[PDB]
Design a protein around this motif. Structure first.
Motif, PDB file in Angstrom:
ATOM      1  N   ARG A 137     -30.857 -63.552  39.349  1.00  0.00           N
ATOM      2  CA  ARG A 137     -31.485 -64.580  40.181  1.00  0.00           C
ATOM      3  C   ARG A 137     -30.931 -64.621  41.593  1.00  0.00           C
ATOM      4  O   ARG A 137     -31.106 -65.606  42.302  1.00  0.00           O
ATOM      5  CB  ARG A 137     -31.436 -65.991  39.578  1.00  0.00           C
ATOM      6  CG  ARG A 137     -31.818 -66.080  38.126  1.00  0.00           C
ATOM      7  CD  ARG A 137     -32.081 -67.521  37.654  1.00  0.00           C
ATOM      8  NE  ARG A 137     -31.142 -68.497  38.203  1.00  0.00           N
ATOM      9  CZ  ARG A 137     -29.923 -68.759  37.741  1.00  0.00           C
ATOM     10  NH1 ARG A 137     -29.454 -68.206  36.629  1.00  0.00           N
ATOM     11  NH2 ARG A 137     -29.155 -69.601  38.420  1.00  0.00           N
ATOM     12  N   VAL A 138     -30.323 -63.538  42.058  1.00  0.00           N
ATOM     13  CA  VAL A 138     -29.826 -63.503  43.428  1.00  0.00           C
ATOM     14  C   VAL A 138     -30.989 -63.481  44.404  1.00  0.00           C
ATOM     15  O   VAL A 138     -31.916 -62.674  44.272  1.00  0.00           O
ATOM     16  CB  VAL A 138     -28.919 -62.282  43.631  1.00  0.00           C
ATOM     17  CG1 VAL A 138     -28.620 -62.076  45.097  1.00  0.00           C
ATOM     18  CG2 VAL A 138     -27.629 -62.437  42.855  1.00  0.00           C
ATOM     19  N   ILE A 139     -30.915 -64.325  45.425  1.00  0.00           N
ATOM     20  CA  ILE A 139     -31.935 -64.406  46.463  1.00  0.00           C
ATOM     21  C   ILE A 139     -31.408 -64.141  47.870  1.00  0.00           C
ATOM     22  O   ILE A 139     -32.217 -64.011  48.794  1.00  0.00           O
ATOM     23  CB  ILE A 139     -32.723 -65.732  46.426  1.00  0.00           C
ATOM     24  CG1 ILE A 139     -31.837 -66.941  46.710  1.00  0.00           C
ATOM     25  CG2 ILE A 139     -33.482 -65.844  45.132  1.00  0.00           C
ATOM     26  CD1 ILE A 139     -32.630 -68.232  46.919  1.00  0.00           C
ATOM     27  N   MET A 176     -31.598 -61.296  53.402  1.00  0.00           N
ATOM     28  CA  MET A 176     -32.058 -60.570  52.225  1.00  0.00           C
ATOM     29  C   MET A 176     -31.814 -59.095  52.519  1.00  0.00           C
ATOM     30  O   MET A 176     -32.400 -58.563  53.475  1.00  0.00           O
ATOM     31  CB  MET A 176     -33.551 -60.827  51.972  1.00  0.00           C
ATOM     32  CG  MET A 176     -33.923 -62.289  51.747  1.00  0.00           C
ATOM     33  SD  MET A 176     -35.669 -62.553  51.316  1.00  0.00           S
ATOM     34  CE  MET A 176     -36.526 -61.712  52.664  1.00  0.00           C
ATOM     35  N   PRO A 177     -30.949 -58.398  51.774  1.00  0.00           N
ATOM     36  CA  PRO A 177     -30.551 -57.043  52.192  1.00  0.00           C
ATOM     37  C   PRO A 177     -31.541 -55.953  51.838  1.00  0.00           C
ATOM     38  O   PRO A 177     -31.449 -54.854  52.408  1.00  0.00           O
ATOM     39  CB  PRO A 177     -29.228 -56.825  51.451  1.00  0.00           C
ATOM     40  CG  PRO A 177     -29.365 -57.649  50.226  1.00  0.00           C
ATOM     41  CD  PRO A 177     -30.148 -58.867  50.625  1.00  0.00           C
ATOM     42  N   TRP A 178     -32.453 -56.202  50.905  1.00  0.00           N
ATOM     43  CA  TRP A 178     -33.433 -55.204  50.530  1.00  0.00           C
ATOM     44  C   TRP A 178     -34.621 -55.261  51.480  1.00  0.00           C
ATOM     45  O   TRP A 178     -34.751 -56.159  52.312  1.00  0.00           O
ATOM     46  CB  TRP A 178     -33.909 -55.423  49.091  1.00  0.00           C
ATOM     47  CG  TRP A 178     -34.593 -56.754  48.872  1.00  0.00           C
ATOM     48  CD1 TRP A 178     -35.879 -57.080  49.192  1.00  0.00           C
ATOM     49  CD2 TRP A 178     -34.014 -57.935  48.298  1.00  0.00           C
ATOM     50  NE1 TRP A 178     -36.132 -58.388  48.864  1.00  0.00           N
ATOM     51  CE2 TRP A 178     -35.008 -58.935  48.306  1.00  0.00           C
ATOM     52  CE3 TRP A 178     -32.754 -58.243  47.776  1.00  0.00           C
ATOM     53  CZ2 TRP A 178     -34.782 -60.216  47.811  1.00  0.00           C
ATOM     54  CZ3 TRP A 178     -32.533 -59.514  47.290  1.00  0.00           C
ATOM     55  CH2 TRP A 178     -33.540 -60.483  47.307  1.00  0.00           C
ATOM     56  N   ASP A 197     -36.045 -55.062  40.540  1.00  0.00           N
ATOM     57  CA  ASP A 197     -35.058 -54.293  39.777  1.00  0.00           C
ATOM     58  C   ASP A 197     -34.042 -53.731  40.767  1.00  0.00           C
ATOM     59  O   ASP A 197     -34.065 -52.560  41.142  1.00  0.00           O
ATOM     60  CB  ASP A 197     -35.755 -53.184  38.998  1.00  0.00           C
ATOM     61  CG  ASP A 197     -34.796 -52.347  38.156  1.00  0.00           C
ATOM     62  OD1 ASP A 197     -33.779 -52.880  37.667  1.00  0.00           O
ATOM     63  OD2 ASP A 197     -35.065 -51.138  37.993  1.00  0.00           O
ATOM     64  N   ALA A 198     -33.138 -54.598  41.210  1.00  0.00           N
ATOM     65  CA  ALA A 198     -32.093 -54.231  42.158  1.00  0.00           C
ATOM     66  C   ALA A 198     -30.885 -55.122  41.928  1.00  0.00           C
ATOM     67  O   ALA A 198     -31.031 -56.317  41.679  1.00  0.00           O
ATOM     68  CB  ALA A 198     -32.559 -54.429  43.612  1.00  0.00           C
ATOM     69  N   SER A 211     -38.464 -49.140  47.479  1.00  0.00           N
ATOM     70  CA  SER A 211     -37.426 -48.352  46.828  1.00  0.00           C
ATOM     71  C   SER A 211     -36.974 -48.898  45.482  1.00  0.00           C
ATOM     72  O   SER A 211     -36.133 -48.262  44.848  1.00  0.00           O
ATOM     73  CB  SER A 211     -36.218 -48.207  47.748  1.00  0.00           C
ATOM     74  OG  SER A 211     -35.673 -49.475  48.043  1.00  0.00           O
ATOM     75  N   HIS A 212     -37.469 -50.042  45.039  1.00  0.00           N
ATOM     76  CA  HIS A 212     -37.160 -50.572  43.720  1.00  0.00           C
ATOM     77  C   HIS A 212     -38.463 -50.920  43.031  1.00  0.00           C
ATOM     78  O   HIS A 212     -39.455 -51.224  43.691  1.00  0.00           O
ATOM     79  CB  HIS A 212     -36.314 -51.837  43.791  1.00  0.00           C
ATOM     80  CG  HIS A 212     -35.023 -51.656  44.514  1.00  0.00           C
ATOM     81  ND1 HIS A 212     -33.911 -51.114  43.914  1.00  0.00           N
ATOM     82  CD2 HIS A 212     -34.666 -51.950  45.784  1.00  0.00           C
ATOM     83  CE1 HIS A 212     -32.925 -51.069  44.792  1.00  0.00           C
ATOM     84  NE2 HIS A 212     -33.357 -51.573  45.933  1.00  0.00           N
ATOM     85  N   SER A 213     -38.452 -50.888  41.698  1.00  0.00           N
ATOM     86  CA  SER A 213     -39.577 -51.439  40.957  1.00  0.00           C
ATOM     87  C   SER A 213     -39.547 -52.954  41.040  1.00  0.00           C
ATOM     88  O   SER A 213     -38.507 -53.567  41.297  1.00  0.00           O
ATOM     89  CB  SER A 213     -39.570 -50.982  39.496  1.00  0.00           C
ATOM     90  OG  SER A 213     -38.374 -51.314  38.824  1.00  0.00           O
TER      91      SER A 213
END
Ligand code: NAP
Ligand code: FOL
Ligand code: MN
Ligand code: MN
Ligand code: MN
Length: 159
Positions: A12-14, A20-22, A116-117, A148-150
């Motif tokens: 549950r990291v936001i 937001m690093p992604w 999925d990260a 880069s992530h699902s």
């Protein structure tokens, strides 16, 4: 009706360090489609993280201190934030953690992206009670050249 929209990494990291690093362009497109032409409520930290007004939406910022930008609407309480939206069908709450906590009990719908990260973070989406919510939509996507992530888009509605 109040809705919350968020993107959650593992656990549950936001967010981390007010960012937001992604980078998931497909999720930002989903965010825009589901928020355009609706009021958006955010906390002051999230306002600073975004760094500019979101076009095509009424931007409402919660802060205990006076506003510092007249391109957006500043309010000092949850009830004032709701009132400032007027009579609209759907109010979108766009975070961050502290704001999500306050609006969750009042929300009827959650628009969640599960990414999925694995992210070190310092901000989490609230623990909500799964039994309270029905999944009415889910759509899974594998990673691709742009994302880069699902990720999984889900809409939940309070039972
Ligand atoms: N992944 C996602 O979906 C997503 C979405 C949004 C944000 N985020 C991340 O979440 C993080 C920010 O979250 P956060 O929990 O630190 O902060 P936040 O919830 O964005 O902002 C908290 C601030 O909002 C104001 N506030 C909140 N409730 C209030 C109330 N009832 N009355 C008056 N003012 C109120 C206060 O401002 P004052 O101190 O000025 O009084 C408070 O310090 C960042 O890392 C951001 O990138 C992630
Ligand atoms: N699913 C989801 N993803 C997020 O990235 C997200 N972000 C926030 C808060 N932070 C942000 C950061 C940037 C933008 C942003 O630049 N939005 C543009 C993107 C348009 C596009 O990429 O097609 C916008 O006009 O909405 C929005 C919210 C709140 N809920 C979310 N919910
Ligand atoms: Mn009050
Ligand atoms: Mn009214
Ligand atoms: Mn991943």
């Amino acid at each position: 009706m109040i809705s919350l929209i968020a993107a959650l990494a593992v656990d549950r990291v936001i967010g981390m360090e007010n960012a937001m690093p992604w980078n998931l362009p497909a999720d930002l497109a989903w965010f825009k489609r589901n928020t355009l032409n609706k009021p958006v409520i955010m906390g002051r930290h999230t306002w600073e993280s975004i760094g500019r007004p979101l076009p095509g939406r009424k931007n409402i910022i919660l802060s205990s201190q006076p506003g510092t930008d007249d391109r957006v609407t500043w309010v000092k309480s949850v009830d004032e934030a709701i009132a400032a939206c007027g009579d609209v069908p759907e109010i979108m709450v766009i975070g961050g953690g502290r704001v999500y906590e306050q609006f969750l009990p009042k929300a009827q719908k959650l628009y969640l992206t599960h990414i999925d990260a694995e992210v070190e973070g310092d901000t989490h989406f609230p623990d909500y009670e799964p039994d309270d919510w029905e999944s009415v939509f889910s759509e899974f996507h594998d990673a691709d050249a742009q994302n880069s992530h699902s990720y999984c888009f889900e809409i939940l509605e309070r039972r």
